[PDB]
Design a binder for this molecule. Sequence first.
Ligand SMILES: Nc1ncnc2c1ncn2[C@@H]1O[C@H](COP(=O)(O)OP(=O)(O)OP(=O)(O)O)[C@@H](O)[C@H]1O
Ligand SMILES: Nc1ncnc2c1ncn2[C@@H]1O[C@H](COP(=O)(O)OP(=O)(O)OP(=O)(O)O)[C@@H](O)[C@H]1O
Ligand SMILES: Nc1ncnc2c1ncn2[C@@H]1O[C@H](COP(=O)(O)OP(=O)(O)OP(=O)(O)O)[C@@H](O)[C@H]1O
Ligand SMILES: [Mg+2]
Ligand SMILES: [Mg+2]
Ligand SMILES: [Mg+2]
Lengths: 401, 398, 441, 104, 193
Amino acid sequence: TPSQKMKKIRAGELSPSMQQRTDLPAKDSSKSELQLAREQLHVSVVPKSLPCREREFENIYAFLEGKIQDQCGGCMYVSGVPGTGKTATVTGVIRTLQRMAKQNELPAFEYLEINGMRLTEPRQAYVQIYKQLTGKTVSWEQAHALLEKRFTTPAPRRVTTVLLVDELDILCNRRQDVVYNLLDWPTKSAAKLVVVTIANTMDLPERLLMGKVTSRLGLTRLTFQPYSHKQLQEIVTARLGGSETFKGEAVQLVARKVAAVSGDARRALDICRRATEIADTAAVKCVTMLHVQQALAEMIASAKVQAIRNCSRMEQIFLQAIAAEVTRTGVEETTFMGVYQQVETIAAFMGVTFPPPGRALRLCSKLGAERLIISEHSRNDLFQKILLNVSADDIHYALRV
Amino acid sequence: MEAICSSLEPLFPCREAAIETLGELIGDSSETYPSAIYLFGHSGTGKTALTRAFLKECGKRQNVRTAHLNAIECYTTKIMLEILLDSLAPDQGDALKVDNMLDFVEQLRRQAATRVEDQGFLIAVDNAERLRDMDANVLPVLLRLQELTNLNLCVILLSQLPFEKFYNKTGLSEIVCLHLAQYNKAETQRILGSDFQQVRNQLLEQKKRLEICQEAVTEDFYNNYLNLFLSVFYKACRDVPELQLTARKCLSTYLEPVLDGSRLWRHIAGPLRSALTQIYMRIESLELPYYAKFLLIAAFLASHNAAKQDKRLFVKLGPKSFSIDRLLAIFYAILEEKVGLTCNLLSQISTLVHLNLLSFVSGEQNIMEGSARLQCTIGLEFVLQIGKVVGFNVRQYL
Amino acid sequence: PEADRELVSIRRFLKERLQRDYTTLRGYAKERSNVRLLLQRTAEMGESNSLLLLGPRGSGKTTLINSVLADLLPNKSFGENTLIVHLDGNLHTDDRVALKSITVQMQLENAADGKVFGSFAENLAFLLQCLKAGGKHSKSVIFILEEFDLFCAHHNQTLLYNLFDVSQSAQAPICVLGVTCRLDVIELLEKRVKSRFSHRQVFLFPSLRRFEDYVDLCRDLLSLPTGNSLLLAAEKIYNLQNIYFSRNHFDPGEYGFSPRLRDAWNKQICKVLATQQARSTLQALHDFDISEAYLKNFLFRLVAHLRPQSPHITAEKMAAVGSQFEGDDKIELLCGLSVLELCLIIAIKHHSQIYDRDSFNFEIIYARFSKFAKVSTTMQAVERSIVLKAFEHLRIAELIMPLTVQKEFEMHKLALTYSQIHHCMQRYQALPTEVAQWAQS
Amino acid sequence: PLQQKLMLCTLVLMLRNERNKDISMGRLHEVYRRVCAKRNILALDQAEFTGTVDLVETRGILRIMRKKEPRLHKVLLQWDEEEVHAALSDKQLIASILSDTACL
Amino acid sequence: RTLEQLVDFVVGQAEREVLPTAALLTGINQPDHLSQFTALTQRLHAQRAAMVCVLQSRDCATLKAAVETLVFGLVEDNAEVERLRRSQCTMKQLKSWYTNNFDSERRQLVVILPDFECFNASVLQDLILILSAHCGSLPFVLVLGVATAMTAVHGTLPYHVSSKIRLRVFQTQAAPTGLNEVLDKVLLSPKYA
DNA sequence: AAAAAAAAAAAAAAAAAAAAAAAAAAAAAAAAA
DNA sequence: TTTTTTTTTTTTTTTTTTTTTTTTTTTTTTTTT
Ligand SMILES: Nc1ncnc2c1ncn2[C@@H]1O[C@H](COP(=O)(O)OP(=O)(O)OP(=O)(O)O)[C@@H](O)[C@H]1O
Ligand SMILES: Nc1ncnc2c1ncn2[C@@H]1O[C@H](COP(=O)(O)OP(=O)(O)OP(=O)(O)O)[C@@H](O)[C@H]1O
Ligand SMILES: Nc1ncnc2c1ncn2[C@@H]1O[C@H](COP(=O)(O)OP(=O)(O)OP(=O)(O)O)[C@@H](O)[C@H]1O
Ligand SMILES: [Mg+2]
Ligand SMILES: [Mg+2]
Ligand SMILES: [Mg+2]
């Protein structure tokens, strides 16, 4: 019976494994140099020593080593825009401290991790923390009671537990009881809990956290600033290593065009991979700057000119008429009746006949599904409101030239 | 497809083009069906009965499984899916269980079979205007159920509106629209004269009158009667069931000088323009208490008579709203007996609200607090009848 | 008679090729190659990717995915080291329903014949525990999410955040496909979901904007193919069915045409499409909508007319189907009203032309109608209730819409234009001259 | 980043030269396109501009009122203009944006 | 007398699409009327001509609650003459129950609406459309409880709704007449001291 | 009496509370031996 | 008479629907000219 399977799953007795391949995977001797550079430029291949994040590594390592050696516990809050190496630096500090604990240079500790976006409710945070100490899946009330008995009652020899909370702002709700429980357990003396919380917004503790929760969160913060173009160039150049599959100016072009938009590292590592896949098709062993410009045109896309260029005749007349009605009445949100009057004017100027209003609603629905315009349901015909989602100069560029 | 059209053309005269198109599209199950057909028309055009008879004849003569719905019944989507999977996957009993659209699509996918049997499915969703009031994924999945379930099925939608009312903010798939245009005068006369044998046998069922009946109640006589009927009735309605239900009664009146013993347009032209005035009433003096009568005409004067003029008329568009203090003030002003404000008077106000002679335009949560606003919902003739049976002239106070 | 059975076979072949045949794709030489090489690099080399097919509704988005999958799946290197999870945003309207479907389609340990045990949170924990425990030694999962913007509308985009997080992590090599009709779907993502999405987007604007490609497509959709091409297509379809659409596909091995019949049919088709009336009808259709679904709808209604008394396709049949397409429908609803509703609509048109589209009422329109009905010598004997029922019939047919009060006093709007009523006055049968004269002034 | 500088400069310009603080995302992007047209900079489309505005909102400089459509989101500045001018530290650029009134 | 007329109407519908309905023009005094309907129900349980559900206006705020109350009333009326959940009561279960019970023998399905004026209008129109759609499947008779006049029924039933209606008007004797009869035969009767 | 602010109220989105359904667990009845 | 199996009822847990809070926008009232 599968109820024994679920009994052993909720107790953690059988491991959740996955199906395996019938073919053995490829060897690194059969791969080309461009395939090896494509494998090293994958964002999932995180390096052991991260470039450009040495000072943040020193900060987090000093905090965590002090909180482990002092046997006290506390809390830290790191933050920054996505792709700036927050979780990679924090888990690298955790791996370095675990390597130092395996060689008796440090007191031992137990490292738990949760992610606020891998939970469906914040209360299920209690189900995951208790699933990382014992391995049993219980209800959240029983898990919260057992965690409360673990962290309030003193018991020698308790070991230090370092709790990582990714995406803290998903645990914040109207009542703020999960985040208050996770930031209140370090304040007790019997709990050797160190809570490091990672998020994106810098002003999160003052924006949406209550006064006691930002009172317990602390003032030891760290901000992961976005990467400059020198830093993206150093990241990608360290990913490539001793190969010469990339040019020295191609990496600089990716770094200059990515560091100006977001400062993300995932964006640079994906645009370089797309450039590698473009250069693989053109039968060249290196990635020149033209493949990089082609990949930067494809990944940083802007395809609202080609969509208007590929519309039909009546749809382009409708797109001219919405812009002409916006010019005529001044306001941006135009009803269907004035748009249809301008349709009749433009079609009588062009000399072609137009469909009746029942098919003009079909043209409006086709343009609204593609989100070239913003339209309502067609149940209120001749009085439905139309916004022009594309700019008015884009239509005059797409149709004139 | 010729057998189904040749079998439906006796039952539906003057619909040979519509039955021809429906036999071209979904007539033969050995050929593939379009993804969705949408046939639409006015009321009384015969689009419930035609698709119902078409689906029954296709299920009898061929290997299809039919389902006829009504989208008014489906207050949730689980009701619609339960009816659909009950009719499309029969002999299932109380084991039928459809959670959502996904379970419906998987259980329809399991109903596929081999190619040599030539099976098909047909779904008729009558009153389809309600489909755009449902949970916003019913209509886009119904329009592509053939592609989704990988079946030889067609979804027939029936409504009184064109398909231009159905386009939503995300778009819809393609559909084969079909128009059932309402009949003109000659086609309507042909439909009304199609039941001549039934009318003749029912008349002969109900003895010199029977002998003088069976000599001339013939087809030309019934067609001249239908000409005299449609000369007066066709301007107000073209709806075929109403014309049938009134033409039978006017024939029952029309045959009186013929059975008793030109020359016939006058004796029916009395009752024909008597019965034209009672079209759309399918029928085969409001007594009130004294103070309820006075409260009702006081509410009429409160809604009608321009509340700035209340300072002059009693102190000695649309119906305007009033508060119950103004109603009681006008009631005590026009009664001139000055009865006691007991509980029965305010109970009469509440039960005149309850009987839909008044209404609640505003308030309804501060009824005792003075912010509730009422409105009178009767006409002038009833107020004049009340003032006549009481003796109080309202036109003096109007 | 033999000449009718061959036409039944031709009509059945053309209808089944138009409706079915989910794998044959026309055009898209670069986009199909991009999607195919991406899926093959995921399955063979174990890479994790994400992709977004974009384009208008009616272009070959699902057909490109079906063509790529039907060409990759009988390889027995893609077919044996890869499991495929199809999700649809119209059916999987919740992350819970989508997660039960992912758990069933991956054949996980808590599935047990299509009835997943555990809650939504337990199913998410078990799915991420299975995907985290994998690596390059495990099978590749290919998630194909159609109606992707509906997956963007879920709670916290939480399933999206997880499906894009296994792609960015040293876990089981999954590949995420997103097939949606919107062009600005990437501004519906949150900043973390947008950061984890590899921004490669494939755009599928149709390559039949110019009219000669439209005429070539209308020729290739109506032609009978060569028997060797028929045998090659039946070979590929039987091969993909040897290992989902393949249960009911086109399968052109059942149809065999003689060379003289195919010769006569293709000569007739090219002779018809060379004319000016057929090209004028295709020009009207190409002016309205350039997608292939509209043309396939036209050609289905054209092929369904092939009765054995009239076997050939001719240009007047195409003109008749174009006349069916191009007409207005509210005008044809207006020609079915009685004369009482027509005088009511003329009174509404007079009120809107005088007062500049002010909202009207039953009493205003009834007064304007009763001023005409006193001198008409045909509408003397209409009551108030019959005109109220005619007003209600105009209201429920949505020729009159409310501004969203008593029923005889609720305000309204005319849902027609003046040109539609002016064409109704010309197309109406047996309209009396009093109404036709009152409509002018 | 440069595109975030050109976003904040355009929002400061539209808050200076107009008394209406109801600034949408499309109305901000239409002025930003003219601004980057005058600087000979290839401006982002709407899809990347929305992510740029969100990445500036993570710093706390803005606040985005979310609506049914991303064109109708309302950007509300929550810093003083001296604070924005100090945080950019790019005086030769913002001095040129505020002198470019004609592209509004 | 009016009870015998209504029973003959139900039986003559059973001896026989639009649904047969019967507007019963009662007085403005509503709490006097429902007991009258109870007497009709007893006579309809005498000849085994039908089984009767009563739909109060308090139970029919929405269409879902009206259909659930209708099916639950009919099923519990059959259970009491000779338990489903609230969300389980559907028209499909009513059709299956009527096929399992009374297709072998037909009982009409009399639906009594005692307070016709106090109904939500859209709920009442959609309920009449639901009942008229199931004609031929389930034999429905619709008894109304109109208190004011027939102008109210003609006003609140639109064109498309009254296109599926074959009503026959009955009349009850007036409340002043009943008062004068009670005063003549009881309060002035000599056999009370 | 109109222009403009201003407080109150309505609409709508979003989060929580409660009801309902479904599964787990414990108690009871009936068969196994 | 004692043990094991299958039914029934209770309690817990999860899902869905309804209510409540919260933000935004409108809107009718109030002050100034
Ligand atoms: N300094 C660096 N050197 C090398 N690789 C880097 C560096 N910073 C980031 N990366 C790469 O970019 C990715 C960033 O992922 P990471 O989880 O660190 O981002 P994050 O800031 O946590 O994002 P989010 O806030 O959205 O969770 C990593 O997978 C890593 O491979
Ligand atoms: N051409 C016709 N020949 C014979 N009878 C017809 C014809 N058209 C309609 N009828 C009759 O009209 C009756 C009612 O029509 P039906 O119920 O189909 O109207 P409908 O199209 O459903 O309108 P609604 O949707 O408003 O109810 C049917 O019983 C049918 O017999
Ligand atoms: N490039 C193409 N090659 C072959 N057939 C096509 C092509 N484009 C469109 N079609 C035809 O258009 C019809 C719909 O195509 P498809 O299902 O690919 O569109 P879609 O993008 O999936 O539509 P939706 O977005 O509504 O699901 C199909 O019948 C298909 O035969
Ligand atoms: Mg992270
Ligand atoms: Mg009907
Ligand atoms: Mg598709």
